[PDB]
Coordinates of C-alpha atoms in Angstrom, one line a residue:
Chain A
X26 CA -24.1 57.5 -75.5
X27 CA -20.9 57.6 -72.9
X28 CA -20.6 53.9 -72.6
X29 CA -22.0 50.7 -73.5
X30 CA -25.5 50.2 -72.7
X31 CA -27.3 47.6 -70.7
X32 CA -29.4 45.9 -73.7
X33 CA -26.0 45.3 -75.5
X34 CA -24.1 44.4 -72.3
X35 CA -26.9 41.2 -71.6
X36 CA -26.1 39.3 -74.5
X37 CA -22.7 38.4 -73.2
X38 CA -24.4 37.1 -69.3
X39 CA -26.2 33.8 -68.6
X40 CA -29.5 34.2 -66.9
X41 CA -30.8 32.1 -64.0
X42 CA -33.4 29.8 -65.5
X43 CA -36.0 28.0 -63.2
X44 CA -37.3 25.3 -63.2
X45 CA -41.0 25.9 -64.7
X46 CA -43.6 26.8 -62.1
X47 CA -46.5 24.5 -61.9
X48 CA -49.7 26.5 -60.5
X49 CA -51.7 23.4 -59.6
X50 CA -50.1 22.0 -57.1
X51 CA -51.4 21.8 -53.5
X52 CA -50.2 20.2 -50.1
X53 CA -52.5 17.2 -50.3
X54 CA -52.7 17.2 -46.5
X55 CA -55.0 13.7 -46.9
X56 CA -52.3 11.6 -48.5
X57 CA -50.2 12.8 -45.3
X58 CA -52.2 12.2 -42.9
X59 CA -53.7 9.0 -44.1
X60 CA -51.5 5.5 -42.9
X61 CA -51.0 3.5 -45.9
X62 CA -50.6 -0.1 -45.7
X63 CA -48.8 -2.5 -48.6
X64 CA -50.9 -5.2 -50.4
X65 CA -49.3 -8.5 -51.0
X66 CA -51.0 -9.1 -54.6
X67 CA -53.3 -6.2 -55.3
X68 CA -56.4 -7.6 -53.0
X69 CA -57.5 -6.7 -49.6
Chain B
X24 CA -23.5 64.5 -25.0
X25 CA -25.9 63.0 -27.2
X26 CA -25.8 63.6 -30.9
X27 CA -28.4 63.9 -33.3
X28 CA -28.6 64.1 -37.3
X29 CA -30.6 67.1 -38.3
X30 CA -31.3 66.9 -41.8
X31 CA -32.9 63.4 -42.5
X32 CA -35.0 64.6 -45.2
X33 CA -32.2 66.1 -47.2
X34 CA -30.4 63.0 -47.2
X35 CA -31.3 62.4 -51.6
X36 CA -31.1 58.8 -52.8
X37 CA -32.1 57.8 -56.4
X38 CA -33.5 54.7 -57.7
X39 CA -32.0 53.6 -60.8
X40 CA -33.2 52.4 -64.5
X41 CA -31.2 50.7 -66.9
X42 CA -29.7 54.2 -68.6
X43 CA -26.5 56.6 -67.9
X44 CA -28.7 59.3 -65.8
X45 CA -26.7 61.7 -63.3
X46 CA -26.6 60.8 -59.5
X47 CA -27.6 63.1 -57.0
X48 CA -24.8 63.9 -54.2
X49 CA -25.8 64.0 -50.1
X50 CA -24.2 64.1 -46.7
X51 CA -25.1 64.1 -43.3
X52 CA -25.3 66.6 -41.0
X53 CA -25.3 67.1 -37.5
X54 CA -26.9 69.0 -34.8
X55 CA -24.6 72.4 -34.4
X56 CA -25.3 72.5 -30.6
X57 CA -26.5 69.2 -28.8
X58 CA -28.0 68.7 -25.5
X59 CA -25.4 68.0 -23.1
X60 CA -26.5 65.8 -20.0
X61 CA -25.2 66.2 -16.7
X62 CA -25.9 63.8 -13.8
X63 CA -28.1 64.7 -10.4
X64 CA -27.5 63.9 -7.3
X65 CA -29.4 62.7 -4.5
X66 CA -27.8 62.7 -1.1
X67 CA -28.2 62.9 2.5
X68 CA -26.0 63.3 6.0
X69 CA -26.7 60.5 8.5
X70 CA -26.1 61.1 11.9
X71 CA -25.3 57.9 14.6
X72 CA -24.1 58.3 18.6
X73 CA -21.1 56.8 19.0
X74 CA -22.7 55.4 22.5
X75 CA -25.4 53.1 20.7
X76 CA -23.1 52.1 18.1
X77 CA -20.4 50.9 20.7
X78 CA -22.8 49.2 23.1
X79 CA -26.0 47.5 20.7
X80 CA -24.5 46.0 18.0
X81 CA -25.1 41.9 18.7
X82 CA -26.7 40.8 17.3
X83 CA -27.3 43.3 14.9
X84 CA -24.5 46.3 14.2
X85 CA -26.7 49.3 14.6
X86 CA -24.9 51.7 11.9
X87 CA -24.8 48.9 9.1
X88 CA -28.6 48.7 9.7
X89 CA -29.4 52.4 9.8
X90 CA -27.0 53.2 6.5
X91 CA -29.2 49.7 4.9
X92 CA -32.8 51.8 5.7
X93 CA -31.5 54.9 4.8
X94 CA -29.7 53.7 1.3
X95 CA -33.2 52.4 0.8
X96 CA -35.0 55.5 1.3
X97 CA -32.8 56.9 -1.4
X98 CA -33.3 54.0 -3.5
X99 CA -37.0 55.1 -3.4
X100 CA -36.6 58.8 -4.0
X101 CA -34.2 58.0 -7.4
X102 CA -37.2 56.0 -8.5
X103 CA -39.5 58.8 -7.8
X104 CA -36.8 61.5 -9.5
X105 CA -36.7 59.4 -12.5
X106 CA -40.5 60.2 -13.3
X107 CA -41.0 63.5 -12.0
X108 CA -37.8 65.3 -12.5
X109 CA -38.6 68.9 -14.0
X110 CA -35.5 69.0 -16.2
X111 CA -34.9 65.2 -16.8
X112 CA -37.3 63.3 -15.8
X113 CA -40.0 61.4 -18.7
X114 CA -43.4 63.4 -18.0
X115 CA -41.2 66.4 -18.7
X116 CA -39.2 65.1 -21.8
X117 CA -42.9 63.8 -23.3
X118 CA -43.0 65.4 -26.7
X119 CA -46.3 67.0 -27.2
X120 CA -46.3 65.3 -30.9
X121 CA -46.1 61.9 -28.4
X122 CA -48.6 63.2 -25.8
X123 CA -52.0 62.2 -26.1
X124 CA -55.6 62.3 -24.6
X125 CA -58.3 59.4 -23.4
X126 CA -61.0 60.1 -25.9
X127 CA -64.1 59.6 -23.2
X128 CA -62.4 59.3 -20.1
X129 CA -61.4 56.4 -18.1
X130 CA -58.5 53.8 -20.1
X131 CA -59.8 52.3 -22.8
X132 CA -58.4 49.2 -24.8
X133 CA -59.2 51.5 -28.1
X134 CA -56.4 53.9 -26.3
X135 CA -54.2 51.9 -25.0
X136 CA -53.9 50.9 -28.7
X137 CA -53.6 54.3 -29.6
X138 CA -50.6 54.3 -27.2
X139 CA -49.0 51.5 -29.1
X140 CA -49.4 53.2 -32.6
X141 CA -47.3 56.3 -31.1
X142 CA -44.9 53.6 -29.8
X143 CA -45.3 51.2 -32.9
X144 CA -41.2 50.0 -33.2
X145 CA -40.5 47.6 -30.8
X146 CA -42.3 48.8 -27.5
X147 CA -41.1 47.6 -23.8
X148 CA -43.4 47.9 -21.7
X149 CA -46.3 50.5 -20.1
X150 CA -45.9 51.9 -16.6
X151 CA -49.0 53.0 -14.7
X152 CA -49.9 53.6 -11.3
X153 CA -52.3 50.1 -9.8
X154 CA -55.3 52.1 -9.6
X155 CA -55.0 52.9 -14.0
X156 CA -54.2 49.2 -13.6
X157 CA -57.4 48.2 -11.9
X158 CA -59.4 51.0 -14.3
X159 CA -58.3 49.4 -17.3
X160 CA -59.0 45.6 -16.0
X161 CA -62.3 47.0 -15.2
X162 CA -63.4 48.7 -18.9
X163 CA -61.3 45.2 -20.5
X164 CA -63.9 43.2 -18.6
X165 CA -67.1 45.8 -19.1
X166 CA -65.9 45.0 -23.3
X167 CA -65.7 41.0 -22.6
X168 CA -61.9 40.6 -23.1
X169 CA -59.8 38.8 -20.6
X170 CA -56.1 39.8 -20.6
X171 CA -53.4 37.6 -20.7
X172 CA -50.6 37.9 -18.5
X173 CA -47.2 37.5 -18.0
X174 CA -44.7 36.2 -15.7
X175 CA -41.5 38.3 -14.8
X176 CA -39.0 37.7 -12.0
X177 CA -41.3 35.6 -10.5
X178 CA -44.4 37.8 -10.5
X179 CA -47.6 38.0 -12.8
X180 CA -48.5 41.1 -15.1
X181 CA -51.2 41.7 -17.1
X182 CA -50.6 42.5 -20.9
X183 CA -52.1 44.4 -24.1
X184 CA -51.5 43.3 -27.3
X185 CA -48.4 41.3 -25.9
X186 CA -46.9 44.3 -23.7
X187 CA -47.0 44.1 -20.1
X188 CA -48.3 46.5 -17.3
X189 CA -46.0 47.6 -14.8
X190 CA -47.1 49.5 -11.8
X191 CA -45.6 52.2 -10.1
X192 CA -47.0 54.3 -7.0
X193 CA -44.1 57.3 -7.6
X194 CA -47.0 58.3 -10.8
X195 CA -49.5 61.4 -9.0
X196 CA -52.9 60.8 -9.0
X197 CA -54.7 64.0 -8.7
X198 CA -58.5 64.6 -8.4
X199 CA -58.8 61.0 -9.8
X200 CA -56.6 61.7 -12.6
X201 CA -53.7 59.8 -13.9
X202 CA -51.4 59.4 -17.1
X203 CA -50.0 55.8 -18.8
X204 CA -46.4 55.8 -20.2
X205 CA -45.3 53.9 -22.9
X206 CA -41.6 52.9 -23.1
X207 CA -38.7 51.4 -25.4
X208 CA -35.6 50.4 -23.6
X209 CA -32.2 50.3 -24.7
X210 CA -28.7 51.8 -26.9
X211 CA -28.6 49.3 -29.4
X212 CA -32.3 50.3 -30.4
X213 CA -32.0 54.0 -30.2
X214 CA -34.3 53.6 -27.1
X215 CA -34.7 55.3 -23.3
X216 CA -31.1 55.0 -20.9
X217 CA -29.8 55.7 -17.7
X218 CA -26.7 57.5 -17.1
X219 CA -24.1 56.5 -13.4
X220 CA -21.3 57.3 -12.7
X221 CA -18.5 54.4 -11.8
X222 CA -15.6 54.1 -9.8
X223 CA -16.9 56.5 -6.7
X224 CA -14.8 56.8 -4.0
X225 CA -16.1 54.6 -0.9
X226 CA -18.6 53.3 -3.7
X227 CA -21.4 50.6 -2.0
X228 CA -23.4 50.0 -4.6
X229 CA -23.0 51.2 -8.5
X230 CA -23.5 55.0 -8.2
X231 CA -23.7 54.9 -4.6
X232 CA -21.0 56.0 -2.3
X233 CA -20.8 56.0 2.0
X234 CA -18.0 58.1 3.1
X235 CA -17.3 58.9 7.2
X236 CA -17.2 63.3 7.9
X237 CA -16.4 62.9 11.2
X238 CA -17.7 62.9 15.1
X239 CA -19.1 66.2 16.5
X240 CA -18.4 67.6 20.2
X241 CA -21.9 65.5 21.3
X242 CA -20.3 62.2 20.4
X243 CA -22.7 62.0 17.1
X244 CA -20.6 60.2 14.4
X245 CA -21.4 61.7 10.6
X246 CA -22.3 60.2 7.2
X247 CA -22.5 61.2 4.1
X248 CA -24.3 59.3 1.6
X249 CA -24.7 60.3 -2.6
X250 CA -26.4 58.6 -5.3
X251 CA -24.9 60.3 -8.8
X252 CA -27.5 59.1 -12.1
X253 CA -29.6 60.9 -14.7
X254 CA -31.4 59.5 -17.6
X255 CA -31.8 60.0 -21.3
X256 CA -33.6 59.4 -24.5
X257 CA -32.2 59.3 -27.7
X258 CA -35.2 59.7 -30.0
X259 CA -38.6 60.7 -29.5
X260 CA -40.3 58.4 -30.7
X261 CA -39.4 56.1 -28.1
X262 CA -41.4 57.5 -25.6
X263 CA -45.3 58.3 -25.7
X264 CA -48.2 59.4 -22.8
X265 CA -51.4 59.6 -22.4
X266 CA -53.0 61.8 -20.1
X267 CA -56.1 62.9 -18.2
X268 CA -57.2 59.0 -17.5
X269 CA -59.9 58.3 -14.7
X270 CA -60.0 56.1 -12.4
X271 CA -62.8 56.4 -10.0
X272 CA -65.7 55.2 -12.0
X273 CA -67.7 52.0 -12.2
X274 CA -70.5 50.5 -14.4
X275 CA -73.7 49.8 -13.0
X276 CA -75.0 45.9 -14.4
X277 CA -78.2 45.3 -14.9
X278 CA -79.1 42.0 -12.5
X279 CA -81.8 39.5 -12.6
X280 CA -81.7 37.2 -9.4
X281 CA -83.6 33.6 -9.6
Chain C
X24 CA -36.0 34.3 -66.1
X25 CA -39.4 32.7 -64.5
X26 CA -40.1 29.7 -66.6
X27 CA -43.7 28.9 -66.5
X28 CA -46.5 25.8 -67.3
X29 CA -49.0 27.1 -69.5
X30 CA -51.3 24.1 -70.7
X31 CA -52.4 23.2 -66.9
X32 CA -55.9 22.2 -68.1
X33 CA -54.3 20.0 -71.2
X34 CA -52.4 17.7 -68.9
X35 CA -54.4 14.8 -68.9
X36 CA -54.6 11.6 -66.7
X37 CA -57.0 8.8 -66.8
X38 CA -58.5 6.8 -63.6
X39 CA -57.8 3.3 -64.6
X40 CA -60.7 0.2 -64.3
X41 CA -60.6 -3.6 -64.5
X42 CA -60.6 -3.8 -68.3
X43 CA -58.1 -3.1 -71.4
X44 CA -59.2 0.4 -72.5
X45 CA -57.0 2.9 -74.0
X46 CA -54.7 5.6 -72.2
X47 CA -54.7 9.4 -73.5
X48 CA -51.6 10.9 -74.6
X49 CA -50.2 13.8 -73.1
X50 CA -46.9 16.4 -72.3
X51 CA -46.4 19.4 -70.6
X52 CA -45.7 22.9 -72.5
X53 CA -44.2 25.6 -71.2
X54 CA -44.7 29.6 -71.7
X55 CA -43.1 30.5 -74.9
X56 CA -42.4 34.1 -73.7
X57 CA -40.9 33.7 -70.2
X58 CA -41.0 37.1 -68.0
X59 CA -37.5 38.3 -67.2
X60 CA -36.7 40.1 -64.0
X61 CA -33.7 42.6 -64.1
X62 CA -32.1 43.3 -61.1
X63 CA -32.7 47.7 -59.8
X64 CA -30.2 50.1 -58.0
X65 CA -30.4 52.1 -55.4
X66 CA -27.7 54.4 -56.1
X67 CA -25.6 57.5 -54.1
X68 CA -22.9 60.0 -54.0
X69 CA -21.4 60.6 -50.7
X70 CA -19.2 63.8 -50.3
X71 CA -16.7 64.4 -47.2
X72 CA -14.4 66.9 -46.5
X73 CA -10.8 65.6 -46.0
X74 CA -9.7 67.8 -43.4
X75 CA -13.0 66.8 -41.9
X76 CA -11.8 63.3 -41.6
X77 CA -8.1 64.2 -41.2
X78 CA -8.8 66.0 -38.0
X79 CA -12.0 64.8 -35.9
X80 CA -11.6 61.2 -36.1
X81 CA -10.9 60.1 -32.5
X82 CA -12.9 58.5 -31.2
X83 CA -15.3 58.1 -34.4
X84 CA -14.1 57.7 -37.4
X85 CA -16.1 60.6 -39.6
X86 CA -16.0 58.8 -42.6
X87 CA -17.4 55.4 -41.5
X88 CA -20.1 57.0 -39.4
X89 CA -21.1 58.9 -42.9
X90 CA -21.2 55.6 -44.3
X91 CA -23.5 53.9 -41.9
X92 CA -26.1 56.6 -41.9
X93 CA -26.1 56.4 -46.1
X94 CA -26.7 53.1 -45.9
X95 CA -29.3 53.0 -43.4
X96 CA -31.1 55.3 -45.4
X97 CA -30.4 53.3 -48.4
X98 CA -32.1 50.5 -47.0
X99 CA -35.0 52.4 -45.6
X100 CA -35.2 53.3 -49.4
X101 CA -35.1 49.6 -51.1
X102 CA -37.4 48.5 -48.0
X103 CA -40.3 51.0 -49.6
X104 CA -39.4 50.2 -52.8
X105 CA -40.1 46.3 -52.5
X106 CA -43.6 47.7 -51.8
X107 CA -44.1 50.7 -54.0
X108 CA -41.9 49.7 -57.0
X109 CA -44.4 50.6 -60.0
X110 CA -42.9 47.3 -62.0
X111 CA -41.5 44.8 -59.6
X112 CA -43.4 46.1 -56.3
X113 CA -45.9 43.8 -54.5
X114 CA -48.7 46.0 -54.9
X115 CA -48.2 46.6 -58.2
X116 CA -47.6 42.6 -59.0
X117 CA -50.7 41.0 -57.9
X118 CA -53.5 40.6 -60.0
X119 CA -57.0 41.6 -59.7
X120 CA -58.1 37.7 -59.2
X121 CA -56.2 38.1 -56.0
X122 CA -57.5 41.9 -55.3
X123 CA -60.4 41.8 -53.3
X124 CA -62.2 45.1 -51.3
X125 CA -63.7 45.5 -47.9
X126 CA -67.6 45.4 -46.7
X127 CA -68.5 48.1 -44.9
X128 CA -65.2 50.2 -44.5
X129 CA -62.7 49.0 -42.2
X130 CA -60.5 45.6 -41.6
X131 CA -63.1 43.0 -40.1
X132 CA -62.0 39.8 -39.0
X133 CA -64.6 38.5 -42.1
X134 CA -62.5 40.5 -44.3
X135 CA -59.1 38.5 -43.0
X136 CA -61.2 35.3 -43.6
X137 CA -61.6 36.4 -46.6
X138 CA -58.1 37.5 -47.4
X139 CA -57.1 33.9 -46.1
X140 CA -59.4 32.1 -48.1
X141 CA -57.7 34.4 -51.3
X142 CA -54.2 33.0 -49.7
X143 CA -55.2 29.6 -48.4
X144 CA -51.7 27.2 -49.1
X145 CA -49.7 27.8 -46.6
X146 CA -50.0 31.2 -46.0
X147 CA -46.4 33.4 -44.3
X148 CA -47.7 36.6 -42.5
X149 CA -49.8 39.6 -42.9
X150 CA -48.1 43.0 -43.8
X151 CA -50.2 46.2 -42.7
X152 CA -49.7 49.8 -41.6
X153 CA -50.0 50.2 -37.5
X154 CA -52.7 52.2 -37.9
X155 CA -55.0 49.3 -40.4
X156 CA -53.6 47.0 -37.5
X157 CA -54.9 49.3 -34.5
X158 CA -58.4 49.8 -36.6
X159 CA -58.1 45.5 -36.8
X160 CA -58.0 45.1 -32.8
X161 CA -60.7 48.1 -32.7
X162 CA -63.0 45.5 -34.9
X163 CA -61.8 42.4 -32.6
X164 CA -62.9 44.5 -29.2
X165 CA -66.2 45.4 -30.7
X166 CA -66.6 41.5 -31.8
X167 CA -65.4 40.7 -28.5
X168 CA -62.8 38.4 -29.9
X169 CA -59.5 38.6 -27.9
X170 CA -56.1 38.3 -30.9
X171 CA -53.5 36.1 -29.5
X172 CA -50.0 37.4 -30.0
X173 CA -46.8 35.8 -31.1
X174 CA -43.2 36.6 -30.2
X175 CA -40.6 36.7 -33.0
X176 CA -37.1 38.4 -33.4
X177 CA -37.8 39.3 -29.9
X178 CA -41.0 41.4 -30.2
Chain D
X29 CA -24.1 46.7 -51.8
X30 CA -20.7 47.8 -52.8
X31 CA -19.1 51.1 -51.8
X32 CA -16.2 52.6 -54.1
X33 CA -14.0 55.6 -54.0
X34 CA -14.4 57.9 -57.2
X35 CA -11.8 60.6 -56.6
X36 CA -11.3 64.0 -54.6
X37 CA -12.1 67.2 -56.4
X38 CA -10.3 70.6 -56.0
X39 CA -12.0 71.5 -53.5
X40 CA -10.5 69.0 -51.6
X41 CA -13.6 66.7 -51.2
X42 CA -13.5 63.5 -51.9
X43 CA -16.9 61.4 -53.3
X44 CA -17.9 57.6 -52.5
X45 CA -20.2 55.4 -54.9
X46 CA -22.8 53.4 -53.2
X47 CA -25.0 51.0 -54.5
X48 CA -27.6 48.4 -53.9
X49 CA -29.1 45.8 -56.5
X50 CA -31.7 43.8 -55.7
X51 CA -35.2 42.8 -57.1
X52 CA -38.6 40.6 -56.0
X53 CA -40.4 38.0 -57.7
X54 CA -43.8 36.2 -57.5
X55 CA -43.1 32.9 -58.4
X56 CA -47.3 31.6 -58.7
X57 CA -49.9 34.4 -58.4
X58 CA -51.9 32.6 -55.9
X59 CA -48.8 33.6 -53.2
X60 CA -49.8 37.5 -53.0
X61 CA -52.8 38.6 -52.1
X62 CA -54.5 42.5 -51.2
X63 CA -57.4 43.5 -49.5
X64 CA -57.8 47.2 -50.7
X65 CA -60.0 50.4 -49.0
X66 CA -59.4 50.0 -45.5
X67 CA -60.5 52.7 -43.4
X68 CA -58.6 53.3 -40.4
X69 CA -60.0 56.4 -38.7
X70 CA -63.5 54.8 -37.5
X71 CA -64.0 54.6 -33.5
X72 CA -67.4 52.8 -32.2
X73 CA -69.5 55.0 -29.7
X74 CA -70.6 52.2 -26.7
X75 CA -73.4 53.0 -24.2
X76 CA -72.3 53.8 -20.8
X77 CA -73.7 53.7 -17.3
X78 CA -71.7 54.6 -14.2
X79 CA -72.5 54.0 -10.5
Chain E
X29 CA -23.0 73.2 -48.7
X30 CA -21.1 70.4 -50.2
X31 CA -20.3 68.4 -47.1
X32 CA -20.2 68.4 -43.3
X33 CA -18.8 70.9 -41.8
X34 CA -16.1 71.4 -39.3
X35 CA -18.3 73.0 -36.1
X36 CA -20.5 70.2 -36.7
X37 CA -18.1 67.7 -37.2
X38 CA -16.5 68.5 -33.7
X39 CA -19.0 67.8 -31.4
X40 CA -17.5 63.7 -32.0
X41 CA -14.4 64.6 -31.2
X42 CA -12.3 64.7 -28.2
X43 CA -10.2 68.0 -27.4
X44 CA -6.6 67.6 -25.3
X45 CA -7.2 69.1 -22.5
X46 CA -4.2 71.0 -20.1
X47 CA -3.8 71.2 -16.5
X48 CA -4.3 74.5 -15.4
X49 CA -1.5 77.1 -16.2
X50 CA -0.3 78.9 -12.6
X51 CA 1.0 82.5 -13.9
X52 CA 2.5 83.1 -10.8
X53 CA 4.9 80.1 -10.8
X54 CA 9.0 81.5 -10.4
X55 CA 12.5 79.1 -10.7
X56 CA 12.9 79.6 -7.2
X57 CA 16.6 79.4 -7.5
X58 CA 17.4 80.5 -3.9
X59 CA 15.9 77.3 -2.6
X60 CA 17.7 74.9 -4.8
X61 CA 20.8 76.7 -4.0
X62 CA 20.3 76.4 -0.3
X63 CA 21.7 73.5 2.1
X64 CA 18.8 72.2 4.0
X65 CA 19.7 70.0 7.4
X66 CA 17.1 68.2 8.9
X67 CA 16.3 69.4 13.0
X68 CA 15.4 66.5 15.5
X69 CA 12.1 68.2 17.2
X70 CA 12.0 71.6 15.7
X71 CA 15.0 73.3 18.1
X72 CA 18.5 74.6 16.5

């Protein structure tokens, strides 16, 4: 070995950690396009 | 003098891994002897009685009107030389790695596609004489595809696959056969230039220069008129052909009349 | 590091009715063994001559124009390895739920439905060789279906 | 990408370092997809009848 | 070949370019030593 190796160097750097992936999501296109209206006490 | 690196497959890079392994070492090297290009010239002497241009010239001068035809006539041949020049002209710098043939004769869309895979990065434009034009309308609507078409300085094209069809009569049509360029344009993409020469003396136009020889002993006043350009392309691959197209044949529709 | 949800089938929400009936419980775990990705080099030695660049430098400069080609062909290089990389490349990183095969041979416009329907949420672009795309608009003329054509970064 | 100068050898050529780091990720699987044996050398033979 | 070589390298550069060298170009002391007087119309 010349110089220090990678596997050793690591332990001294902080990785970049995202957020966790969530595979089920979809666009939900209806809930966009649809024109929602606000109910004064629950009853239409 | 254009320039050229000549060893682009000895020019070693390494991918890496996480480990101390040697690197390799490269340079780049160029052409020992480039092509040098050297500008043409088309010119002409233009002769004008001294008589005429003193005595009809209102309201019209006479001598600006004959140098304005004849400046167009040589307008005209540059166009011409810039297709059919033996030594620089684009049917004769065609690469026969770029040159290509019509599989069953007459301009197919399935080789005009061809064309564009030889000219793949960023293509310009095709140039073909009207009657390839019409020939190639003619097998696009014998397959049931309409082209779209363009718009450019205020007239319509037809396209392929996005890249318009500009038409040209200075292209030979022999024995009903033609050939369809493919072009890219441009330094700052390596593509297909032309080369003037500024600052002429008695200059007109860019590359274009009028200058007075003198009157003869019949009263005939001289011209001389010269047009300096040449043209280039800086890689191959920005320049492609196909050849041996027809143009004279028609398909035969079945009919059935109520 | 590429966090991940690994219970997607565990999370569990109830559709409510007029009534007083009990709620499930629920949380969401994560993959206890996260992939990594380590960042790759592309790495060179460039060699030139100092009388080389001592003399002919006017008006290039021999050692910057030495340096522009090495790069370009450096990133010709990481360009074919974002596709060809055997453990980060593309081809190489999807997953044989997402591999699907032609028909009858070559690109049909019901084989692009059917990649589309593989890549359905908002899918980017297509990425082909010019000769797959010249066999594509072979298939679209003998369909008789005219491609319509986009312009971007000028082409 | 970085570029650095390493030193000139007695043979009076001097060497330059350049590298590039970089690396892809597929954040959800459903984001790549491949269509795989794709033939590209087949040309249809049409009928023809000329006047 | 380690590196680039000079013929190559050349063909970017620009050479310094003389005017033409005249061999046959004297002093001509005889003519700078000489009084010159300008004549109206050619007649002395």
């Amino acid at each position: 070995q010349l110089a220090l190796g990678d596997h050793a160097a690591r332990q001294l750097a902080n990785a970049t950690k995202t957020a966790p992936q969530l595979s089920t999501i979809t666009p939900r296109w209806l809930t966009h396009l649809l024109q929602w209206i606000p109910v004064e006490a629950g009853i239409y | 003098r254009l320039n050229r690196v000549n060893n682009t497959d000895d020019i070693q890079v390494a991918c890496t891994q996480r480990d101390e392994a040697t690197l390799p070492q490269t340079f780049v090297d160029y052409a020992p002897e480039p092509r040098e290009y050297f500008l043409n010239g088309v010119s002409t002497v233009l002769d004008v009685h001294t008589r005429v241009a003193d005595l009809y010239s209102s309201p019209h001068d006479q001598i600006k009107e004959q140098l304005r035809l004849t400046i167009e006539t040589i307008k005209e041949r540059q166009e011409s030389e810039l297709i059919n020049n033996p030594e620089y002209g684009l049917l004769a710098s065609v690469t026969d790695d770029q040159r290509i043939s019509t599989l069953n004769g007459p301009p197919t869309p399935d080789d005009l596609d061809d064309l564009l895979r030889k000219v793949w990065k960023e293509p310009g434009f095709f140039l073909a004489h009207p009657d390839a034009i019409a020939a190639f309308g003619r097998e696009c609507t014998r397959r049931g595809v309409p082209p779209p078409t363009v718009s450019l300085f205020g007239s319509q094209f037809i396209t392929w696959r996005g890249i318009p069809l500009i038409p040209s009569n200075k292209i030979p049509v022999e024995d009903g056969k033609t050939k369809i360029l493919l072009l890219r344009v441009g330094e700052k993409r390596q593509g297909i230039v032309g080369l003037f020469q500024p600052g002429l003396a008695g200059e007109q136009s860019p590359g274009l220069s009028v200058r007075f020889m003198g009157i003869n002993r019949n009263a005939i006043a001289s011209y001389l008129i010269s047009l300096y350009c040449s043209l280039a392309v800086l890689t191959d691959d920005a320049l492609a052909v196909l050849d041996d197209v027809e143009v004279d044949k028609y398909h035969d529709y079945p009919v059935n009349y109520k």
